[PDB]
Amino acid sequence: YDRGVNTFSPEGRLFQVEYAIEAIKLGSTAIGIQTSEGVCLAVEKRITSPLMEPSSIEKIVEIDAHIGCAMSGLIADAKTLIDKARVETQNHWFTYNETMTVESVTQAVSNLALQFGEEDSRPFGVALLFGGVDEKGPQLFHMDPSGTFVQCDARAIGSASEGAQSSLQEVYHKSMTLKEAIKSSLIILKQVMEEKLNATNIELATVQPGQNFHMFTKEELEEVIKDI
Amino acid sequence: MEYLIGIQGPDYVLVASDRVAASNIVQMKDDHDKMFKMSEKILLLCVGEAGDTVQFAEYIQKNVQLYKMRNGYELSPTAAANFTRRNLADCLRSRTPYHVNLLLAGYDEHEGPALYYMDYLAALAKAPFAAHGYGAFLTLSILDRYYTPTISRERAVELLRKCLEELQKRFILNLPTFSVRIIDKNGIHDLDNISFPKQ
Amino acid sequence: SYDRAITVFSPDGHLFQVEYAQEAVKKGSTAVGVRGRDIVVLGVEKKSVAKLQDERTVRKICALDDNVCMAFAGLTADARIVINRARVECQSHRLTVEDPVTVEYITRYIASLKQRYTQSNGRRPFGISALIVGFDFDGTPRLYQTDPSGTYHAWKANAIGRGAKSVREFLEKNYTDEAIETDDLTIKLVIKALLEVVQSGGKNIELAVMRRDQSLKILNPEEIEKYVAEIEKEKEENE
Amino acid sequence: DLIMAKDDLSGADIKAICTEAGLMALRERRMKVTNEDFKKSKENVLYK
Amino acid sequence: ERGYSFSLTTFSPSGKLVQIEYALAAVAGGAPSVGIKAANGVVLATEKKQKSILYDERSVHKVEPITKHIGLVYSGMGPDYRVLVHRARKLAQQYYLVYQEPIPTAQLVQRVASVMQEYTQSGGVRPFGVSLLICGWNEGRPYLFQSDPSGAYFAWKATAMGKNYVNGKTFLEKRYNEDLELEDAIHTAILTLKESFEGQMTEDNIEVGICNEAGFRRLTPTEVKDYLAAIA
Amino acid sequence: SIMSYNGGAVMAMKGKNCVAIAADRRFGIQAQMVTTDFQKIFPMGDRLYIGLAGLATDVQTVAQRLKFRLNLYELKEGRQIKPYTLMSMVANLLYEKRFGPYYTEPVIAGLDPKTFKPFICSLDLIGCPMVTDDFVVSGTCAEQMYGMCESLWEPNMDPDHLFETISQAMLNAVDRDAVSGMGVIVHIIEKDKITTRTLKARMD
Amino acid sequence: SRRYDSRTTIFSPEGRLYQVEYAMEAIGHAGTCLGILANDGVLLAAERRNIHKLLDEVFFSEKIYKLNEDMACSVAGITSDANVLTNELRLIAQRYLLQYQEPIPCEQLVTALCDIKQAYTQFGGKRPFGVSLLYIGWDKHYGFQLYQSDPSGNYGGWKATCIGNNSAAAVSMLKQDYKEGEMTLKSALALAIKVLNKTMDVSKLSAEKVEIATLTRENGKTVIRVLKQKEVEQLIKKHEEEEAKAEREK
Amino acid sequence: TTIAGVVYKDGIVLGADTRATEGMVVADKNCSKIHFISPNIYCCGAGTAADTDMTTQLISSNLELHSLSTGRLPRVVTANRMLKQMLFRYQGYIGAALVLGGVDVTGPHLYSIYPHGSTDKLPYVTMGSGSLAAMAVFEDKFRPDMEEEEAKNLVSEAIAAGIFNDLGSGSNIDLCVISKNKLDFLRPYTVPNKKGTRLGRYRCEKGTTAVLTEKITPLE
Secondary structure, eight states: OOOOTTOOOSSSSOSHHHHHHHHTTTSOOEEEEEETTEEEEEEEOOOOOSSBOGGGOOSSOBSSSSOBEEOOSOSHHHHHHHHHHHHHHHHHHHHHSSOOOHHHHHHHHHTSTTOOOSOOOOOOOOOEEEEEEETTEEEEEEEOTTOOOEEOSSOBOSTTHHHHHHHHHHHOOTTOOHHHHHHHHHHHHHHHOSSOOOTTTEEEOOBOSSSOSOOOOTTHHHHHHTTO | OOOOOEEEOSSOEEEEEEOOBOOSSSOOBSSOOOOOOOSSSEEEOOOBSTTHHHHHHHHHHHHHHHHHHHHSSOOOHHHHHHHHHHHHHHHHSSSSOOOBOOOEEEEOSSSOEEEBOOOTTOOOOBOSSOOOTTHHHHHHHHHHHSOOSSOOHHHHHHHHHHHHHTTTTSOSSOOOEEEEEEEETTEEEEOOOEEOOOO | OOOOOOOOBOTTSOBHHHHHHHHHHHTSOOEEEEEOSSOEEEEEOOOOOOSSSOOSSOOOOOOSSSSEEOOOOBOHHHHHHHHHHHHHHHHHHHHSSOSOOOHHHHHHHHHHHHHHHHHSSSBOOOOBOOEEEEEOGGGOEEEEEOOTTOOOEEBSBOOBSTTHHHHHHHHHTTOOGGGGTSHHHHHHHHHHHHHTSSOOOSSSOEEEEEOSSSOOEEOOTTHHHHHHHHHHHHHHHTO | OOTTTOTTOOHHHHHHHHHHHHHHHTTTTOSSOOHHHHHHHHHHHTOO | OOSOOOOOOOBOSSSOBHHHHHHHHHHHTSOOEEEEEETTEEEEEEEOOOSSSSOOSSSOOSSEEEETTEEEEEEEOHHHHHHHHHHHHHHHHHHHHHHSSOOOHHHHHHHHHHHHHHHHHSTTOOOOOEEEEEEEEOSSSEEEEEBOTTSOBOOBSEEEESTTHHHHHHHHHHHOOSOOOHHHHHHHHHHHHHTTSOSOOOTTTEEEEEEETTEEEEOOHHHHHHHTTTOO | OOTTSSOOEEEEEEOSSOEEEEEEOOEEETTEEEESOOOOEEEOSTTEEEEOOBOHHHHHHHHHHHHHHHHHHHHHSSSOOOHHHHHHHHHHHHHTTSSSOOOBOOEEEEEOSSSOOEEEEEOOTTOOOEEOSSEEEEESOHHHHHHHHHHHOOSSOOHHHHHHHHHHHHHHHHHHOSSSOSOEEEEEEOSSEEEEEEEOOOOO | OOTTOOOOSSOOTTSSOSHHHHHHHHHSSSOOOBOBOSSSOEEEEEEOSOOOTTBOOTTSOSSOEEOSSSEEEOEEEOHHHHHHHHHHHHHHHHHHHHHHSSOOOHHHHHHHHHHHHHHHHHBSSOOOOOEEEEEEEOOSSSOSEEEEOOTTSOOOBOSBOOOSGGGHHHHHHHHHTOOSSOOOTTHHHHHHHHHHHHHSOSTTOOGGGEEEEEEOOOSSOOOEEEOOSHHHHHHHHHHHHHHHHHGGGO | OEEEEEEOSSSEEEEEEOOEEETTEEEESSOOOEEESSSSOEEEEESSHHHHHHHHHHHHHHHHHHHHHHTSOOOHHHHHHHHHHHHHHTTTOSOOEEEEEEEOSSOEEEEEEETTTEEEEOSEEEEESSHHHHHHHHHHSOOSSOOHHHHHHHHHHHHHHHHHHOSSOOSOEEEEEEOSSOEEEESOSOOOOOOOOOSSOOOOOTTOSOEEEOOEEEOO
């Protein structure tokens, strides 16, 4: 029984945005942790086949030289927003000679998180984790399809976010360090993933005021995993 | 300004150009290239308003590559020439005209060789030997003196040698080096670069 | 124009038409493709021809550039549209930057077009899935596939069309590094994979290769017959 | 010769031809079934 | 006007254009008509009954010229008829602007059929419920062209449309021939119109136009009253 | 002027039962010639030609546009085209560019498709038709060809005297002209056949 | 304003397109064509759907539409949609000639029309074109050709074609009487006469109910021969005498 | 070009001269400036020829359309209103010097239109380059409510004086008479100029011109 797609609920919410919040849940997990040393971040790739070449799946993409990101669930709706967010950060540094802070980036994205309509189509289906180091120190940011953007100190998303948030609130406090948070994230990863944790499953992305750019090539991941 | 010559033969086309890039009064570049390979048997040269030359190469070159990749095969030289004339003739009566003057050089498997001839007013022509510019004047008498429709290619090279010797003799310009191509049933063959040592 | 949203989310978190337009891919012809290290090979099975007519128009493998190659599944008309737009895009890239067009760019273009096509107002999603094989600069063979969702996704061998689970299961127990040592063996490996697929009479086995410093060569179906014959000879030598 | 004939024939079509050929066979008091029996049966089952 | 633009015309499960079949039925429920081509001219004739004795016969006209040599009647609904008549009017004048020559009837039928077909494809609109009978004397040989709601068209020697078109057509197959004069065409046309109408047929219940090679001519109730002596 | 940029002359002459159209061959840029084989007389169906004179851009452009509309007309209607129809078509095509005008003076010469009736007419650069009975001319050297045809024309002409009259007219009127020369092509057509002759003109 | 909307574009949940197949089953009725390319020429065959005694036949044409100098097309389906298509197709080929001054090759013509049809299959909810149609023609690169349009936008070159549902058995007959390039223009005509004699159930094939047009290759003409009726009559008499000769084997 | 119009006791007499000059050279000796509008309304043109032609064909198309839509005889004021509205929309770029005449139910009505859009109703008008001479002849020999042959003689006399004076005038003289019932249209009214027969037959012979290349193409 097909109603108009821009119909609220008998209870109050909407429909299609709520169905988007449901559509997040099938996606792969991701974990980002704010630390005053810098923002660390982790994700799972969910490798399916051995024919599937592993280094091509993107989860952490690059918005600015100091603003990172991670995506979830649908890949390509996220790709549009990543491209556009990059464009708008370039417009800000151009017309202002300065760095668009991460909150202003995410305001610019959730301005049209919901412009879905028939004139002037569907709501987007991706949850995003935004990091980076602005002038306000490190920042970790989380949005949703509904544009309800909030700051989170260490948010975990997607399919395993219940036990991830719970066991994350077990281990987290305010004065953590970097590497402790990195292994604290990947312990949660290899409790919530399904396959054996190895060199090809996960990927990290850490950005620091000292380690100036988010840089994470392979096989330091090997050194981090053999430290478990 | 300059001129690039295009002598047609029985079964070959002898095109050439300069390596000269004009300025205010200075010769900015002495190894310039005016050759725009449309296809395996169709060349293109361009002289005119020097901002339009590269964009004409863009438009024509890329749309010919589109036809070749779509349908599976190469254009005739005649249809390509007419297509250039059409885009000139459309671009003339607007707010944005193009000002170029170059002849087109192709080779068909069936029609054999073919030479065409443009103008800044989009006129087609099927010429035995054509020209533009100021070298046009000083060179077409020599060429129309020593022409035979059934002429061999080394005679054409010697004739072009002679034509250059009358270009460096009574001209108010420099023109030190000319590049020379040839087109045959085999494709695009580059001949040697035709210069004179000065000192 | 047509102010409507065709593709609505599900109550349980799906796009009906993206997941469901994969079925149209699932009910098309099969096509495999592997990369060797120096010679790339792909080809389609199940032409399911009338054996008595023309065949130059039903060619399911085409090219966009002198560097890149095609394959697809699903219905053929959407492939025709996407290939026309891809040719235009790769040549317009050659208009700008003077390189030969990288394969990753044209796959991102196809997937981006497909996603903004599914997103838009009342446009039915493309029920195809292409294979884009090319070897860009410094000779690196790479191969990507598409999806009606619009996820370019790099693989090492193919599994699309009818019964792709069986074909990938054969490639699973046939991932030998030895198979991509001899170019001839890689060709024979495609022939053996497609032989572990449909009738493979040596009629609907249309295959084309590229040795990464040339253009695509469509093979005349007598060489493929000798390939199948020596495959049957090695199968007899197995006993 | 019969497998190639229809691209989407089922076992219904196969039973129909294998019985209609027999009905053509006992129309002319025979036991064995020739090729034109299958041809007529193919042209009777499929295209009518 | 709103952004819908969707065609309400959908094929059947079988493959049939249900709104065109229904439009043909709506044509078949209309007033009858007959039109006959007979070597020198073409005769059109309709059947125009007032509902009461109150109505006037000088206001509405069935037989209608499109150019000085092209007549046109229908069998369907007048409210759509006048619209596509006006369209054919405007369309014929663009041809006469372009070529400075009176348009041939085949070219009219091409363009009108293109309009009607293009309009049944177009979105949120119903088809016309009108079947035409177009005629004219272009380049010596006169013509006669029937169209339909489906956009198609034909070329007839003699035909009918409306109520009891089958009965009138079976009368036409027996009655008509290859060669007649205009008067005999009028005779068989009023005969086949008299096949299906009521008993009182006067100078006003029918309305008859002819075509000569000298041009179109729309007859008057004077000659119509002159004609029904020794009627049909 | 812009009309004197490339030269050009087109003559058409009505005979007794036949019609002859001729033009020059020269192409070039105001004082510099280029070729001797430039086409200015185009076939539009059988036994009906058109001649175009003036700026060569508009010559080829209007010729291709007219061929476009002509083939569309002859495919929408199975018959071939009457000459008045072609005249009106050229008038409408030129008048669509009322303020963006082409620089050309088309000359139509053709026979009747039903009878053997000849037909000549000419148009201006905005679309003004003009039907006559003797001759129409177009190009730079107007007054020369006017002097020739008002000097040499007779009403009832067999094709031989028609050919010689138009030959002498074109040769003499072109030889007095400067920018237009370099050969003459002559089309002499009739009910049965079409004849094309080239004259021994001064190559100067 | 959305409950009235007919949704003629969204896939069906059986797995295929929905309206597309029903356009195909609208192709299947009212129509039966084929042609026989097998050298020096190509032909088209057609059945009169309105063979009633009260027509005019004054058009000097029927189902055939000479769309250029060197291409025609046979129609099957709803007629006036195809008139919309023939007008647009003729205008496409003519604009190509305007653009290049060289005649139009037959496959980019076919793909232009296929993109037009797929443009109304893909987006909006517009009703699809219920017309399949044939193609005969000539080029500079392959000679004589045959093509099969479909309402999806899919096409495909053949050497012996088929549209109408009555002619699937004709494709069976075309395979059972397949030749390897043997069109002496009497063998192919007798074969086409034999096919339309068997497949249509019209007893003995009255020549007013059929239509045959050919396309031969001449140096400067490329004539399209929409042939008259008397040669069709003597062709039918030739074929019925050859059927009497062929049934002397019983 | 010198056209004139007049209103006699019943209808309208229009005249013309059929010399179509192009610059300084006589381009035509037989043309037609009196154009069709309707079965009762005609029009004459001056100045730019093709502008007058296309404009009068458009307005004649629109009035045929309107008259066939209505079912009665057209009115002259409708033609006047359409012409002045169109010519004012073109801002005087189109040069079309028109004389408009027809007979309605109200009677005869003559209008002259100047190419910007200024119109006047008059009993008699002259337009063109040599219109001044014909307007002189009219003001010399006009009286109200003339008869038919008087008006025809007057218009012929006026256009004749315009042809014997003006340089762009001069050809054989067109006339046209519109009544309530009778429309007449007479091209060779009083052909004034003869031409001397040639004094030398300068006829060429069969082969006096060298031929380089022949071609023959047969037909049916």
